Design a protein around this motif. Structure first.
Motif, PDB file in Angstrom:
ATOM      1  N   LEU A   7       0.833  -1.186   0.000  1.00 34.80           N
ATOM      2  CA  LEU A   7       0.000   0.000   0.000  1.00 34.80           C
ATOM      3  C   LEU A   7       0.872   1.242   0.000  1.00 34.80           C
ATOM      4  O   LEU A   7       1.883   1.293   0.701  1.00 34.80           O
ATOM      5  N   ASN A   9       0.581   5.885  -0.945  1.00 36.91           N
ATOM      6  CA  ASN A   9      -0.290   7.036  -1.114  1.00 36.91           C
ATOM      7  C   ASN A   9      -1.405   7.013  -0.069  1.00 36.91           C
ATOM      8  O   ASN A   9      -2.538   7.423  -0.351  1.00 36.91           O
ATOM      9  N   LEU A  10      -1.077   6.562   1.144  1.00 37.20           N
ATOM     10  CA  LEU A  10      -2.028   6.532   2.243  1.00 37.20           C
ATOM     11  C   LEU A  10      -2.052   7.874   2.968  1.00 37.20           C
ATOM     12  O   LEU A  10      -1.047   8.333   3.513  1.00 37.20           O
ATOM     13  N   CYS A  14      -5.997   7.228   6.588  1.00 37.61           N
ATOM     14  CA  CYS A  14      -5.988   5.839   6.141  1.00 37.61           C
ATOM     15  C   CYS A  14      -4.895   5.097   6.907  1.00 37.61           C
ATOM     16  O   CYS A  14      -3.861   4.677   6.354  1.00 37.61           O
ATOM     17  N   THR A  44       2.342  11.318   2.399  1.00 37.50           N
ATOM     18  CA  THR A  44       1.543  10.108   2.526  1.00 37.50           C
ATOM     19  C   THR A  44       2.389   8.975   3.060  1.00 37.50           C
ATOM     20  O   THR A  44       3.628   9.021   3.019  1.00 37.50           O
ATOM     21  N   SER A  46       3.059   4.592   3.634  1.00 38.36           N
ATOM     22  CA  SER A  46       3.121   3.345   2.894  1.00 38.36           C
ATOM     23  C   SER A  46       3.398   2.186   3.834  1.00 38.36           C
ATOM     24  O   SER A  46       3.873   2.375   4.950  1.00 38.36           O
ATOM     25  N   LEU A  64      -9.862  -1.404  -1.079  1.00 34.56           N
ATOM     26  CA  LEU A  64      -8.869  -0.337  -1.050  1.00 34.56           C
ATOM     27  C   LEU A  64      -8.391   0.134  -2.403  1.00 34.56           C
ATOM     28  O   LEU A  64      -7.973   1.277  -2.524  1.00 34.56           O
ATOM     29  N   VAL A  74      -5.728   5.583  -2.708  1.00 40.06           N
ATOM     30  CA  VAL A  74      -4.921   4.471  -2.247  1.00 40.06           C
ATOM     31  C   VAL A  74      -4.404   3.681  -3.428  1.00 40.06           C
ATOM     32  O   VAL A  74      -5.162   3.282  -4.315  1.00 40.06           O
ATOM     33  N   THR A  76      -2.072   0.431  -4.751  1.00 37.58           N
ATOM     34  CA  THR A  76      -1.765  -0.908  -4.303  1.00 37.58           C
ATOM     35  C   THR A  76      -0.814  -1.619  -5.237  1.00 37.58           C
ATOM     36  O   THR A  76      -0.697  -1.283  -6.425  1.00 37.58           O
TER      37      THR A  76
END
Length: 79
Positions: A7, A9-10, A14, A44, A46, A64, A74, A76
């Motif tokens: 993951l 760009n959280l 998030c 962000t 990760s 997500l 988000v 992935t």
């Protein structure tokens, strides 16, 4: 077979608690939820969620993948 969802760009919201909640809501017990990176350029986070099998990973991936949370989409990857 162990399945890990990476993951990035959280947004701040998030967060690990949110991800744990999503897993709980699906009756999924991941091996590990780990948000261990921060990107100063984009502000962000990760990390990854390591699942026991692909079936579990699928349900969380579906939720997500390309979801907008806290201003950021988000992003992935499977392994």
């Amino acid at each position: 077979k162990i399945s890990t969802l990476f993951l990035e760009n959280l947004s701040a919201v998030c967060n690990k608690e949110f991800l744990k909640y999503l897993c709980h809501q699906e009756n999924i017990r991941p091996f590990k939820i780990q948000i261990d990176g921060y990107d100063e350029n984009s502000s962000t986070y990760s990390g990854f969620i390591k699942f026991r099998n692909f079936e579990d990973a699928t349900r969380i991936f579906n939720f997500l993948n390309n979801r907008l949370v806290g201003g950021s989409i988000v992003t992935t990857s499977w392994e």
